[PDB]
Protein backbone atom coordinates (compact mmCIF):
# COMPACT_ATOMS: atom_id res chain seq x y z
CA UNK A 1 0.00 0.00 0.00
CA UNK A 2 1.79 3.09 -1.29
CA UNK A 3 1.74 6.06 1.07
CA UNK A 4 -0.19 9.15 -0.03
CA UNK A 5 -0.60 12.56 1.57
CA UNK A 6 -3.89 13.49 3.24
CA UNK A 7 -5.41 16.96 3.52
CA UNK A 8 -6.65 17.86 7.01
CA UNK A 9 -8.76 20.97 7.61
CA UNK A 10 -8.33 22.36 11.13
CA UNK A 11 -11.53 24.28 11.95
CA UNK A 12 -10.70 27.96 11.64
CA UNK A 13 -9.46 27.78 8.05
CA UNK A 14 -6.00 26.25 8.44
CA UNK A 15 -5.25 23.05 6.53
CA UNK A 16 -2.18 20.84 6.21
CA UNK A 17 -1.15 17.44 4.86
CA UNK A 18 0.14 14.26 6.52
CA UNK A 19 1.36 11.06 4.86
CA UNK A 20 -0.85 7.99 5.43
CA UNK A 21 -1.60 4.62 3.83
CA UNK A 22 -4.71 2.82 2.59
CA UNK A 23 -4.63 0.44 5.57
CA UNK A 24 -4.03 2.87 8.45
CA UNK A 25 -6.35 3.03 11.44
CA UNK A 26 -7.89 6.24 12.77
CA UNK A 27 -5.77 5.94 15.93
CA UNK A 28 -2.58 5.96 13.86
CA UNK A 29 -3.91 8.90 11.82
CA UNK A 30 -4.59 10.95 14.96
CA UNK A 31 -1.11 9.98 16.15
CA UNK A 32 0.41 11.33 12.92
CA UNK A 33 -1.64 14.52 13.33
CA UNK A 34 -0.24 14.77 16.86
CA UNK A 35 3.29 14.49 15.46
CA UNK A 36 2.59 17.10 12.76
CA UNK A 37 0.61 19.77 14.62
CA UNK A 38 0.97 18.90 18.33
CA UNK A 39 -2.65 18.41 19.36
CA UNK A 40 -2.80 15.13 21.34
CA UNK A 41 -4.87 12.20 20.15
CA UNK A 42 -7.63 12.39 22.78
CA UNK A 43 -8.40 15.99 21.77
CA UNK A 44 -8.84 15.06 18.09
CA UNK A 45 -12.40 14.50 16.88
CA UNK A 46 -12.46 13.86 13.14
CA UNK A 47 -15.27 14.25 10.61
CA UNK A 48 -15.46 13.39 6.90
CA UNK A 49 -18.28 15.40 5.29
CA UNK A 50 -20.16 15.06 8.62
CA UNK A 51 -19.44 11.34 9.04
CA UNK A 52 -17.89 10.69 12.45
CA UNK A 53 -14.67 8.70 12.32
CA UNK A 54 -14.03 6.04 14.96
CA UNK A 55 -10.72 4.76 16.30
CA UNK A 56 -9.92 1.37 14.82
CA UNK A 57 -11.25 1.97 11.32
CA UNK A 58 -9.32 1.52 8.08
CA UNK A 59 -8.97 4.52 5.78
CA UNK A 60 -9.87 2.27 2.84
CA UNK A 61 -13.11 1.25 4.58
CA UNK A 62 -14.02 4.96 4.55
CA UNK A 63 -13.16 5.36 0.86
CA UNK A 64 -11.52 8.74 1.45
CA UNK A 65 -8.77 9.65 -0.98
CA UNK A 66 -5.97 12.14 -1.58
CA UNK A 67 -8.59 14.55 -2.89
CA UNK A 68 -10.76 14.01 0.23
CA UNK A 69 -10.69 16.63 2.99
CA UNK A 70 -11.12 15.72 6.67
CA UNK A 71 -12.35 18.27 9.20
CA UNK A 72 -10.51 18.22 12.53
CA UNK A 73 -12.16 19.55 15.70
CA UNK A 74 -10.30 19.89 19.01
CA UNK A 75 -12.40 18.86 22.03
CA UNK A 76 -11.60 21.33 24.81
CA UNK A 77 -13.90 19.45 27.22
CA UNK A 78 -14.40 15.74 26.57
CA UNK A 79 -17.51 13.96 27.81
CA UNK A 80 -16.69 11.53 30.64
CA UNK A 81 -15.77 7.88 30.32
CA UNK A 82 -15.49 4.80 32.52
CA UNK A 83 -12.28 2.92 33.32
CA UNK A 84 -11.37 -0.07 35.47
CA UNK A 85 -8.84 -0.15 38.32
CA UNK A 86 -7.59 -3.51 39.56
CA UNK A 87 -5.90 -4.10 42.91
CA UNK A 88 -3.35 -6.59 44.22
CA UNK A 89 -6.42 -8.82 44.65
CA UNK A 90 -7.29 -8.15 41.00
CA UNK A 91 -10.80 -6.84 41.76
CA UNK A 92 -11.62 -4.29 39.06
CA UNK A 93 -13.61 -1.21 40.08
CA UNK A 94 -15.50 1.31 37.94
CA UNK A 95 -14.31 4.92 37.83
CA UNK A 96 -15.81 7.81 35.85
CA UNK A 97 -13.09 10.20 34.69
CA UNK A 98 -12.49 13.01 32.20
CA UNK A 99 -9.47 12.86 29.89
CA UNK A 100 -8.71 16.55 30.59
CA UNK A 101 -8.18 15.85 34.31
CA UNK A 102 -4.94 15.28 36.18
CA UNK A 103 -3.93 11.88 37.53
CA UNK A 104 -3.85 13.50 40.98
CA UNK A 105 -7.65 13.86 40.82
CA UNK A 106 -8.04 10.12 40.21
CA UNK A 107 -5.55 9.43 43.01
CA UNK A 108 -7.75 11.53 45.30
CA UNK A 109 -10.90 9.68 44.20
CA UNK A 110 -9.46 6.21 44.79
CA UNK A 111 -7.80 7.64 47.91
CA UNK A 112 -11.23 8.38 49.40
CA UNK A 113 -12.78 5.22 47.93
CA UNK A 114 -10.27 2.79 49.49
CA UNK A 115 -8.79 4.98 52.30
CA UNK A 116 -5.20 4.44 51.08
CA UNK A 117 -3.34 7.75 51.23
CA UNK A 118 -2.19 9.37 47.99
CA UNK A 119 1.48 8.93 48.96
CA UNK A 120 1.20 5.15 49.48
CA UNK A 121 0.21 3.87 46.01
CA UNK A 122 0.92 4.66 42.37
CA UNK A 123 -1.06 3.93 39.21
CA UNK A 124 0.17 2.44 35.94
CA UNK A 125 -1.38 2.04 32.48
CA UNK A 126 -0.11 -0.58 30.00
CA UNK A 127 2.93 -0.95 32.26
CA UNK A 128 3.69 2.77 31.95
CA UNK A 129 3.65 4.59 35.31
CA UNK A 130 1.19 7.49 35.36
CA UNK A 131 2.69 10.82 36.38
CA UNK A 132 0.98 12.75 39.15
CA UNK A 133 0.58 16.02 37.20
CA UNK A 134 0.10 14.68 33.66
CA UNK A 135 -3.31 14.64 32.00
CA UNK A 136 -4.92 11.21 31.74
CA UNK A 137 -5.58 11.64 28.01
CA UNK A 138 -1.82 11.66 27.37
CA UNK A 139 -1.81 7.93 28.18
CA UNK A 140 -4.31 6.84 25.52
CA UNK A 141 -7.08 6.02 28.00
CA UNK A 142 -9.81 4.24 26.06
CA UNK A 143 -13.25 3.58 27.58
CA UNK A 144 -13.32 0.55 29.89
CA UNK A 145 -9.52 0.35 29.88
CA UNK A 146 -7.70 -1.22 32.83
CA UNK A 147 -5.59 0.97 35.11
CA UNK A 148 -3.41 -1.02 37.50
CA UNK A 149 -3.03 0.10 41.13
CA UNK A 150 0.39 -0.49 42.69
CA UNK A 151 1.46 -0.70 46.35
Curated annotation (Swiss-Prot):
Ubiquitin-like protein which plays a key role in the innate immune response to viral infection either via its conjugation to a target protein (ISGylation) or via its action as a free or unconjugated protein. ISGylation involves a cascade of enzymatic reactions involving E1, E2, and E3 enzymes which catalyze the conjugation of ISG15 to a lysine residue in the target protein. Its target proteins include SERPINA3G/SPI2A, JAK1, MAPK3/ERK1, PLCG1, TRIM25, STAT5A, MAPK1/ERK2 and globin. Keywords: Antiviral defense, Cytoplasm, Disulfide bond, Isopeptide bond, Repeat, S-nitrosylation, Secreted, Ubl conjugation pathway. SUPFAM superfamilies: Ubiquitin-like. One of its GO terms (biological process) is positive regulation of protein oligomerization. It comes from the Eukaryota. The modification S-nitrosocysteine is found at residues 77, 145. GO terms for molecular function: integrin binding; protein tag activity. InterPro entries: Ubiquilin (IPR015496), Ubiquitin-like_dom (IPR000626), Ubiquitin-like_domsf (IPR029071). Gene3D superfamilies: Phosphatidylinositol 3-kinase Catalytic Subunit, Chain A, domain 1. Both the Ubiquitin-like 1 and Ubiquitin-like 2 domains are required for its efficient conjugation to cellular proteins. The two domains play different roles in the ISGylation pathway: Ubiquitin-like 2 domain is necessary for the first two steps allowing the linking of ISG15 to the E1 and E2 enzymes while Ubiquitin-like 1 domain is essential for the final, E3-mediated transfer of ISG15, from the E2 to the Lys of the target protein. It is found in: Cytoplasm; Secreted. One of its GO terms (cellular component) is extracellular region. Homodimer; disulfide-linked. Interacts with, and is conjugated to its targets by the UBE1L (E1 enzyme) and UBE2E2 (E2 enzyme). Interacts with NEDD4. Interacts with PARP12; this interaction inhibits PINK1/Parkin-dependent mitophagy. Induction: By type I interferons. The lineage of its organism: Eukaryota, Metazoa, Chordata, Craniata, Vertebrata. It comes from Mus musculus. This is Ubiquitin-like protein ISG15. Residues 3-77, 78-151 form the Ubiquitin-like domain. Its main location: cytoplasm. S-nitrosylation decreases its dimerization, thereby increasing the availability as well as the solubility of monomeric ISG15 for its conjugation to cellular proteins. Induced as an inactive, precursor protein that is cleaved by specific proteases to expose the C-terminal diglycine (LRLRGG) motif. This motif is essential not only for its conjugation to substrates but also for its recognition by the relevant processing proteases.
Amino acid sequence: HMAWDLKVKMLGGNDFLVSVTNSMTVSELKKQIAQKIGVPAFQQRLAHQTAVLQDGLTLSSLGLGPSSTVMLVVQNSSEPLSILVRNERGHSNIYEVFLTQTVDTLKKKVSQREQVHEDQFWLSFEGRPMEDKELLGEYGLKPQCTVIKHL
